[PDB]
């Protein structure tokens, strides 16, 4: 396999864009996390007083186990792969590897029967996946989304006071500012971004079918529910007390849906930026002094990848949350694809950041449009009329706007014919589209 | 239109099952909520000291406005429909109606210019829909889901101690209890049910494009952001400070996804109950004394409706969250269908409740299966072996289980050949599949 | 139920837009088609020589049965509903109704035991639904799509020669004509429209589980496969020889996917028209002589409804095509919603037709844009250079276009500096953006 | 990149299962097909009499071009990648490569200006993708589906006469045969499999925006529509005369939907096989002589991958079929993922084939169930009653079946109490559930 011959663009065309996820989602990562889980389980038994058959671990034993995790590499992963030759269960190959390693330590040599003690394969797998999700989000996904938010915020702040014609149903409307329109997207991102950071990833640890049966058979006297809760919560996960063989994956569905919400806001953003480029509101920043068009390719690339990511995330939320009776195995193969969904998202985020850095505001395009659309002041005139209790204020302005092409002159002429205080007239005669932006700039400044 | 000739089964075949939603989602409801919003806006202006042009409302005026809402009916809705003849905007027809009504009150007669003051149609619509969603969830949806949860919980409690063979990949596995398997579903429902109750429905109120432009044109001196925040929050909604013409609908997406999560757990439930019926684990409760099969039709009906509801909820979350620039109108028609999605859910909930009430446990079916599958004790033997540091405990039991058809006799014989303490042997020889349920019943009792 | 209180906008806000579908999809329609199917089955037995126990029907008997179908009304539907009080199966209520009616005819009085002979409920239901689909498509859906195609074609023909600036990635590109851009959509619609017309709707008729078991028990000597094939094919349907209790619904999936393909082309159309309106390329046709903006609301309404229709059609294709073993009943409730999906489509088609009729071309907007974008001729210059074997033709024009703002003057100046035949220069100096439309108009004229 | 560190299981865990697709979908494949398209275009110009500026190619020139395609390798792909350093468009790098190669041939040296003559990048890309799709389907996908169909057919034929209890709504029903139930799936696969083989993949070739503008600028006298039609149809593709810059991708949507239809039938199959395994109807074929359970893992793996494939195929059909105006670029990145969808399908097909080969019928399980469910003969008794005009035949059998547990004895006793011919009684008294399979075996034998 080379990136040239890869079928998926995640490991092919975009291989350099997605590498950050490889330590979390890959056959190597899954092996690393299963190994970590098996060792940490064994350690939890050594740490428990009511399980005297596993003695407390001494300095040298702790370090040996610690070193298995920090020294884990391709070579060692291949060794575990070697053991898969013998087993029905991949997870069993990790137990075999550990049995092998325990021989190298005087104290551990003796304790091999307690590796994977009372566990089912899914006890190990669900924890491994819970940790992969938790860490991919904490180290890669949440920080990247934070960066995109900062990027759009910076653009919003910079263009806080840049007046702009609105378009509602595609057509000239009450003005805003470019920075306000940009800040609106960051405001939408805040809630699901915080939700993404805060979700504790669910995990269970309770034997074959969720009832600690084998645990209780061997150690009726150990408080297994307490032991397993403390084990799982020690890893920074959300202990699920109530499961079958599998953790039911509703937490994966929740995380998938948070990602969908984020991706859809960003989808909306890429489509609006593309429109602003189309209108010439942005040009390329970088003959050196001459204005040039910016190619919106990065936003179009993000747009395509955001949809692919959602396709998979939506599927996960729907499919993983049914499993026949105490479970069917059809979720296993699907879980190997969590990384693919996050990868399409990540590629999209990188594209948004890259496109954002190309944008330079084109003030003259924005000003041309405002100066051609004086009709957008009509509501200002109408609302001032209302204040002074003028009856048919809306109909009157509709009669005006539909009967002539409005500019400064006709507006002034209409205003004078109104029965409103002279000061009120004067203020309306000062109004221009570029100065009818309401609280747009104030809202941008207030935004954090 | 009669229910016989309706195209949608929501207003046809299932008309009686869905009526509870009509006061929240229907052209009548939308009119009622727009009217309420317009009146409450007008009242907020009267209540504001910095807007002296609308005087504080006296006893009689408050009651008149109050009465417009409580006395609203088909007759009045038809009257508003009458005004739609004149207008581009449906919401405008409500203003016309109110202009008409204000004539009937000495004080209100004078204040007609302040109805819909500085508002855009979408200010009224988004609030109306926010309230419809909020109240449909608070009065109908959340309580119905609470009822389904209670129903499954009661079944779980009743069958807490009823031993049952598990099936993993469809095949005999470590035992559980029927009540434990039922409680697992309620445990999954807890989190999204609480999330459904807690979501404050987003709403905005800020003029044509989100910047209070018309407000500021007429009243530069009024703190509009404060006024509008207090207005929206007074209604029990989540004020959105940052919008275009529309509220961006990410809250609708969040609510839709919570509903999807709930529906998927219930989808899983209907499919498992169907399987338990298929296995004869349940029979009909209601020749009077003779056992009869229960027809799983109610669970199959729920299954079909849960999928339809999700189809729409998924669509809402994806489609409503993009809108071109300061908005396109394609969301309007889509919002008229929120009730349809909730209706498919509601029909499904009613079906689950109805099916649940038909289930009677069939103990002999459950016992037959346990007594035929002694192989499921193997892990108990293995894990006891591990405790006493016996080396190849897993391989030994695999060699046993794959070479003979296991019953009590072969098991006893194998156990005796083990090198474990005599007391350990004795306890394993007491074990039976129906008594190998681990902490299933303890977990059911602990469940709330 | 009134349209005001309906939850679904299909039977509410849009009740008048969707009535054409009521005779095909409604509880009344389903009853009508079940009745028709039961009668036509009974007639097929009378018509079979090897079934002498049902005598050939005489003039009076044929007319009596014929009249049951043509005289079917609300009153009669209510009577069948009356019998549902007694039955597990709705279809059984139709048999009871017919038993009742057969008493009114001397010959039929005697043959009541042969109503629903050897049938299962699903034999009747699948045929009823097959006919509802077949006829809704033949009478309503396919003709409406044909009308939309004609509408867009007429617009295309009218604007065949109207030069227009293209936009690729939102930005000025090689010109086309408005009519060519419109005709492109009709070209896409041709194939799935023909496919929609040609699909023969699958139907089966073979007893409880697909094997004619009950038929063969009573009449081992009758060729049931031949009888049932001829019965189903006589109705204009596609006989499925191989089924369980249900027809497996892959034909419904195929039809749903054809509808999805059509709806997506029309979705693309509504979005482009909205953009052309936004650019001012269209204005309202209908102060009388003054240009006015067209509001794109009809296209936005179509856009929203097309997505809703696809949401349901996609769901049907995925969900209806699994059914557990010899069937589960969860498809039943889902089938009652086929009409809802077609209804969202129909509302969208009506909206497209209505919007199309508002469009008037705005030539000056189109001409302004062409005259401002002479850079789009660059490829013409380059390709003429290639013809005369000029080496770096692309790089040279990129060097030109990126270094100055191109107009007629700079272009002429550049052209003269080329080493190409004098006649070649002269033809390029004649070129203008509005005259660089290639074969756009020729392709429009050729289109049918 | 190694398979261990790949994020996608397509190029990771399942790398060996998916390699067949690499020559069709990979950055290498895309380069190969772009190169082939560019060369074949150039050849089409040489072959055209009205384009004398490109002379007819001589033996040596044809072979040189031919050799570029057959000798294409990683080395050459890397060389094209080298040129991407200089270009905005990847396709341009192929032109540069060819310019380079043309130097090595006396005749071709002279014709470099005609490489990519009048083409746009998308002319090359859409053809390249059309060929990749066409060939992946013809060489890999359609033959693999053919193999799965044969596999299920063989199982159906082998078990043609093996009586089996049906289950409708999970519950005992009229018998069938195992082979009939299997053949039902192959019958469903026939139509979409033939449709998959027959679809001619759409492709266009017409310059920047679909109008041959640049072609006509340089060669007004050449019949470009005829030339390009013949070019595209010579490649075994479906010429699209009517496009913008892109081929509109409705053919990709059609192919995606055919794949969805196939995958859903196979999804249904994997779920039923899993149920038959659960019931013990199948055991493992391979202590040597003792019956052992078959683990349904291969069917569960297929189930998971079929859903992933559909997620992507559904997305393609919806998203690729809109593109803003004369096109946006967001489809480009999405097209790089066509292979991923086909790969999930292929992995699933391999799993189905692999699971099928493990199944051995377990006759005693099937016979036990039939012999315990004599109630399923009731409809036979009822239908024989109907034949001899017995009035309440259905109600009578319901009264029987609901009042006692039916076996051979009660049935015989009931039959004797009927007023039907003595021969009719005798034949019903011979009936047993295992002999009430109707035309199941006859239908299996007839199946091809």
mmCIF file of N, CA, C and O in Angstrom, chain B residues 87-143:
data_model
loop_
_atom_site.group_PDB
_atom_site.id
_atom_site.type_symbol
_atom_site.label_atom_id
_atom_site.label_comp_id
_atom_site.label_asym_id
_atom_site.label_seq_id
_atom_site.Cartn_x
_atom_site.Cartn_y
_atom_site.Cartn_z
ATOM 1 N N UNK B 87 -52.971 40.569 1.740
ATOM 2 C CA UNK B 87 -51.568 40.681 2.153
ATOM 3 C C UNK B 87 -50.596 39.775 1.407
ATOM 4 O O UNK B 87 -50.962 38.681 0.981
ATOM 5 N N UNK B 88 -49.346 40.230 1.287
ATOM 6 C CA UNK B 88 -48.233 39.346 0.906
ATOM 7 C C UNK B 88 -47.894 38.359 2.050
ATOM 8 O O UNK B 88 -47.668 37.174 1.810
ATOM 9 N N UNK B 89 -47.902 38.852 3.287
ATOM 10 C CA UNK B 89 -47.506 38.074 4.450
ATOM 11 C C UNK B 89 -48.703 37.650 5.296
ATOM 12 O O UNK B 89 -49.533 38.492 5.659
ATOM 13 N N UNK B 90 -48.787 36.352 5.611
ATOM 14 C CA UNK B 90 -49.809 35.816 6.505
ATOM 15 C C UNK B 90 -49.821 36.529 7.842
ATOM 16 O O UNK B 90 -50.885 36.784 8.400
ATOM 17 N N UNK B 91 -48.634 36.816 8.371
ATOM 18 C CA UNK B 91 -48.510 37.492 9.668
ATOM 19 C C UNK B 91 -49.182 38.867 9.653
ATOM 20 O O UNK B 91 -49.740 39.309 10.661
ATOM 21 N N UNK B 92 -49.117 39.541 8.510
ATOM 22 C CA UNK B 92 -49.770 40.841 8.329
ATOM 23 C C UNK B 92 -51.286 40.759 8.576
ATOM 24 O O UNK B 92 -51.879 41.694 9.095
ATOM 25 N N UNK B 93 -51.892 39.632 8.213
ATOM 26 C CA UNK B 93 -53.325 39.420 8.427
ATOM 27 C C UNK B 93 -53.674 39.482 9.913
ATOM 28 O O UNK B 93 -54.743 39.974 10.272
ATOM 29 N N UNK B 94 -52.761 39.017 10.770
ATOM 30 C CA UNK B 94 -52.922 39.118 12.227
ATOM 31 C C UNK B 94 -52.875 40.582 12.698
ATOM 32 O O UNK B 94 -53.696 41.006 13.533
ATOM 33 N N UNK B 95 -51.938 41.364 12.163
ATOM 34 C CA UNK B 95 -51.905 42.789 12.472
ATOM 35 C C UNK B 95 -53.241 43.466 12.109
ATOM 36 O O UNK B 95 -53.821 44.191 12.935
ATOM 37 N N UNK B 96 -53.743 43.202 10.897
ATOM 38 C CA UNK B 96 -55.056 43.723 10.456
ATOM 39 C C UNK B 96 -56.221 43.358 11.371
ATOM 40 O O UNK B 96 -57.096 44.187 11.656
ATOM 41 N N UNK B 97 -56.241 42.104 11.803
ATOM 42 C CA UNK B 97 -57.231 41.626 12.754
ATOM 43 C C UNK B 97 -57.170 42.452 14.039
ATOM 44 O O UNK B 97 -58.200 42.929 14.532
ATOM 45 N N UNK B 98 -55.954 42.639 14.559
ATOM 46 C CA UNK B 98 -55.718 43.390 15.797
ATOM 47 C C UNK B 98 -56.068 44.867 15.686
ATOM 48 O O UNK B 98 -56.645 45.444 16.621
ATOM 49 N N UNK B 99 -55.714 45.475 14.554
ATOM 50 C CA UNK B 99 -56.137 46.840 14.253
ATOM 51 C C UNK B 99 -57.645 46.975 14.418
ATOM 52 O O UNK B 99 -58.139 47.962 14.980
ATOM 53 N N UNK B 100 -58.359 45.971 13.908
ATOM 54 C CA UNK B 100 -59.815 45.882 13.954
ATOM 55 C C UNK B 100 -60.332 45.793 15.393
ATOM 56 O O UNK B 100 -61.261 46.504 15.781
ATOM 57 N N UNK B 101 -59.722 44.907 16.170
ATOM 58 C CA UNK B 101 -60.101 44.669 17.557
ATOM 59 C C UNK B 101 -59.807 45.871 18.457
ATOM 60 O O UNK B 101 -60.579 46.174 19.367
ATOM 61 N N UNK B 102 -58.701 46.561 18.186
ATOM 62 C CA UNK B 102 -58.279 47.694 19.008
ATOM 63 C C UNK B 102 -59.316 48.824 19.000
ATOM 64 O O UNK B 102 -59.403 49.594 19.955
ATOM 65 N N UNK B 103 -60.114 48.891 17.934
ATOM 66 C CA UNK B 103 -61.232 49.851 17.829
ATOM 67 C C UNK B 103 -62.269 49.683 18.929
ATOM 68 O O UNK B 103 -62.969 50.638 19.271
ATOM 69 N N UNK B 104 -62.375 48.472 19.473
ATOM 70 C CA UNK B 104 -63.391 48.154 20.481
ATOM 71 C C UNK B 104 -63.016 48.580 21.904
ATOM 72 O O UNK B 104 -63.803 48.377 22.834
ATOM 73 N N UNK B 105 -61.820 49.145 22.068
ATOM 74 C CA UNK B 105 -61.322 49.624 23.361
ATOM 75 C C UNK B 105 -60.827 51.076 23.263
ATOM 76 O O UNK B 105 -59.927 51.370 22.478
ATOM 77 N N UNK B 106 -61.417 51.968 24.064
ATOM 78 C CA UNK B 106 -61.099 53.415 24.053
ATOM 79 C C UNK B 106 -59.590 53.716 24.030
ATOM 80 O O UNK B 106 -59.116 54.523 23.217
ATOM 81 N N UNK B 107 -58.845 53.032 24.902
ATOM 82 C CA UNK B 107 -57.398 53.205 25.042
ATOM 83 C C UNK B 107 -56.625 52.573 23.877
ATOM 84 O O UNK B 107 -55.725 53.200 23.308
ATOM 85 N N UNK B 108 -56.981 51.340 23.526
ATOM 86 C CA UNK B 108 -56.321 50.632 22.426
ATOM 87 C C UNK B 108 -56.613 51.254 21.058
ATOM 88 O O UNK B 108 -55.735 51.272 20.206
ATOM 89 N N UNK B 109 -57.825 51.785 20.865
ATOM 90 C CA UNK B 109 -58.199 52.481 19.620
ATOM 91 C C UNK B 109 -57.080 53.392 19.126
ATOM 92 O O UNK B 109 -56.845 53.510 17.920
ATOM 93 N N UNK B 110 -56.376 53.993 20.084
ATOM 94 C CA UNK B 110 -55.407 55.047 19.828
ATOM 95 C C UNK B 110 -54.015 54.547 19.476
ATOM 96 O O UNK B 110 -53.194 55.308 18.969
ATOM 97 N N UNK B 111 -53.758 53.268 19.742
ATOM 98 C CA UNK B 111 -52.410 52.722 19.732
ATOM 99 C C UNK B 111 -52.123 51.779 18.565
ATOM 100 O O UNK B 111 -51.108 51.068 18.575
ATOM 101 N N UNK B 112 -53.009 51.780 17.570
ATOM 102 C CA UNK B 112 -52.922 50.839 16.450
ATOM 103 C C UNK B 112 -51.584 50.871 15.687
ATOM 104 O O UNK B 112 -51.125 49.823 15.237
ATOM 105 N N UNK B 113 -50.969 52.057 15.566
ATOM 106 C CA UNK B 113 -49.670 52.216 14.885
ATOM 107 C C UNK B 113 -48.539 51.449 15.563
ATOM 108 O O UNK B 113 -47.486 51.223 14.952
ATOM 109 N N UNK B 114 -48.747 51.057 16.816
ATOM 110 C CA UNK B 114 -47.738 50.302 17.542
ATOM 111 C C UNK B 114 -47.897 48.769 17.493
ATOM 112 O O UNK B 114 -47.030 48.053 17.986
ATOM 113 N N UNK B 115 -48.975 48.273 16.883
ATOM 114 C CA UNK B 115 -49.098 46.828 16.615
ATOM 115 C C UNK B 115 -48.023 46.441 15.591
ATOM 116 O O UNK B 115 -47.908 47.103 14.551
ATOM 117 N N UNK B 116 -47.231 45.407 15.893
ATOM 118 C CA UNK B 116 -46.169 44.896 14.994
ATOM 119 C C UNK B 116 -45.068 45.960 14.830
ATOM 120 O O UNK B 116 -44.356 45.984 13.814
ATOM 121 N N UNK B 117 -44.913 46.828 15.839
ATOM 122 C CA UNK B 117 -43.935 47.925 15.761
ATOM 123 C C UNK B 117 -42.501 47.439 15.569
ATOM 124 O O UNK B 117 -41.985 46.685 16.402
ATOM 125 N N UNK B 118 -41.871 47.907 14.482
ATOM 126 C CA UNK B 118 -40.487 47.566 14.080
ATOM 127 C C UNK B 118 -40.232 46.069 13.819
ATOM 128 O O UNK B 118 -39.103 45.672 13.593
ATOM 129 N N UNK B 119 -41.282 45.256 13.808
ATOM 130 C CA UNK B 119 -41.125 43.810 13.623
ATOM 131 C C UNK B 119 -41.021 43.458 12.169
ATOM 132 O O UNK B 119 -41.518 44.196 11.302
ATOM 133 N N UNK B 120 -40.361 42.331 11.921
ATOM 134 C CA UNK B 120 -40.445 41.643 10.658
ATOM 135 C C UNK B 120 -41.325 40.399 10.871
ATOM 136 O O UNK B 120 -41.512 39.938 12.003
ATOM 137 N N UNK B 121 -41.879 39.870 9.787
ATOM 138 C CA UNK B 121 -42.735 38.685 9.874
ATOM 139 C C UNK B 121 -42.058 37.548 10.622
ATOM 140 O O UNK B 121 -42.694 36.873 11.442
ATOM 141 N N UNK B 122 -40.771 37.342 10.337
ATOM 142 C CA UNK B 122 -40.031 36.245 10.933
ATOM 143 C C UNK B 122 -39.801 36.402 12.452
ATOM 144 O O UNK B 122 -39.671 35.402 13.144
ATOM 145 N N UNK B 123 -39.812 37.636 12.968
ATOM 146 C CA UNK B 123 -39.784 37.900 14.411
ATOM 147 C C UNK B 123 -40.982 37.193 15.053
ATOM 148 O O UNK B 123 -40.834 36.478 16.049
ATOM 149 N N UNK B 124 -42.153 37.359 14.444
ATOM 150 C CA UNK B 124 -43.372 36.757 14.940
ATOM 151 C C UNK B 124 -43.380 35.242 14.717
ATOM 152 O O UNK B 124 -43.708 34.467 15.643
ATOM 153 N N UNK B 125 -43.044 34.817 13.501
ATOM 154 C CA UNK B 125 -43.082 33.376 13.164
ATOM 155 C C UNK B 125 -42.141 32.536 14.016
ATOM 156 O O UNK B 125 -42.535 31.459 14.508
ATOM 157 N N UNK B 126 -40.904 33.005 14.198
ATOM 158 C CA UNK B 126 -39.936 32.160 14.922
ATOM 159 C C UNK B 126 -40.339 31.970 16.391
ATOM 160 O O UNK B 126 -40.216 30.867 16.937
ATOM 161 N N UNK B 127 -40.869 33.032 16.999
ATOM 162 C CA UNK B 127 -41.396 32.972 18.360
ATOM 163 C C UNK B 127 -42.591 32.051 18.446
ATOM 164 O O UNK B 127 -42.670 31.231 19.370
ATOM 165 N N UNK B 128 -43.508 32.172 17.483
ATOM 166 C CA UNK B 128 -44.693 31.308 17.422
ATOM 167 C C UNK B 128 -44.281 29.848 17.347
ATOM 168 O O UNK B 128 -44.756 29.029 18.131
ATOM 169 N N UNK B 129 -43.373 29.519 16.437
ATOM 170 C CA UNK B 129 -42.881 28.149 16.340
ATOM 171 C C UNK B 129 -42.107 27.707 17.567
ATOM 172 O O UNK B 129 -42.256 26.562 17.983
ATOM 173 N N UNK B 130 -41.272 28.594 18.133
ATOM 174 C CA UNK B 130 -40.564 28.268 19.373
ATOM 175 C C UNK B 130 -41.548 27.865 20.487
ATOM 176 O O UNK B 130 -41.359 26.842 21.149
ATOM 177 N N UNK B 131 -42.597 28.669 20.693
ATOM 178 C CA UNK B 131 -43.641 28.335 21.662
ATOM 179 C C UNK B 131 -44.406 27.045 21.352
ATOM 180 O O UNK B 131 -44.668 26.260 22.259
ATOM 181 N N UNK B 132 -44.775 26.820 20.088
ATOM 182 C CA UNK B 132 -45.405 25.551 19.683
ATOM 183 C C UNK B 132 -44.537 24.335 20.034
ATOM 184 O O UNK B 132 -45.018 23.367 20.622
ATOM 185 N N UNK B 133 -43.247 24.410 19.711
ATOM 186 C CA UNK B 133 -42.321 23.325 20.041
ATOM 187 C C UNK B 133 -42.217 23.143 21.559
ATOM 188 O O UNK B 133 -42.387 22.035 22.070
ATOM 189 N N UNK B 134 -41.923 24.235 22.255
ATOM 190 C CA UNK B 134 -41.778 24.231 23.714
ATOM 191 C C UNK B 134 -42.973 23.564 24.388
ATOM 192 O O UNK B 134 -42.802 22.686 25.251
ATOM 193 N N UNK B 135 -44.170 23.976 23.990
ATOM 194 C CA UNK B 135 -45.380 23.501 24.653
ATOM 195 C C UNK B 135 -45.793 22.110 24.236
ATOM 196 O O UNK B 135 -46.287 21.343 25.068
ATOM 197 N N UNK B 136 -45.583 21.765 22.963
ATOM 198 C CA UNK B 136 -45.887 20.396 22.524
ATOM 199 C C UNK B 136 -45.006 19.411 23.309
ATOM 200 O O UNK B 136 -45.475 18.367 23.769
ATOM 201 N N UNK B 137 -43.741 19.758 23.485
ATOM 202 C CA UNK B 137 -42.829 18.914 24.249
ATOM 203 C C UNK B 137 -43.219 18.857 25.735
ATOM 204 O O UNK B 137 -43.321 17.758 26.299
ATOM 205 N N UNK B 138 -43.439 20.022 26.349
ATOM 206 C CA UNK B 138 -43.797 20.107 27.781
ATOM 207 C C UNK B 138 -45.133 19.447 28.094
ATOM 208 O O UNK B 138 -45.231 18.736 29.073
ATOM 209 N N UNK B 139 -46.147 19.626 27.244
ATOM 210 C CA UNK B 139 -47.491 19.102 27.573
ATOM 211 C C UNK B 139 -47.796 17.700 27.038
ATOM 212 O O UNK B 139 -48.599 16.992 27.637
ATOM 213 N N UNK B 140 -47.215 17.327 25.891
ATOM 214 C CA UNK B 140 -47.579 16.071 25.210
ATOM 215 C C UNK B 140 -46.391 15.093 25.108
ATOM 216 O O UNK B 140 -46.480 13.933 25.571
ATOM 217 N N UNK B 141 -45.290 15.536 24.493
ATOM 218 C CA UNK B 141 -44.223 14.587 24.094
ATOM 219 C C UNK B 141 -43.429 14.070 25.297
ATOM 220 O O UNK B 141 -43.355 12.866 25.527
ATOM 221 N N UNK B 142 -42.868 14.980 26.077
ATOM 222 C CA UNK B 142 -42.099 14.558 27.246
ATOM 223 C C UNK B 142 -42.945 13.708 28.240
ATOM 224 O O UNK B 142 -42.467 12.661 28.717
ATOM 225 N N UNK B 143 -44.178 14.150 28.582
ATOM 226 C CA UNK B 143 -44.997 13.251 29.421
ATOM 227 C C UNK B 143 -45.318 11.895 28.830
ATOM 228 O O UNK B 143 -45.388 10.919 29.592
#
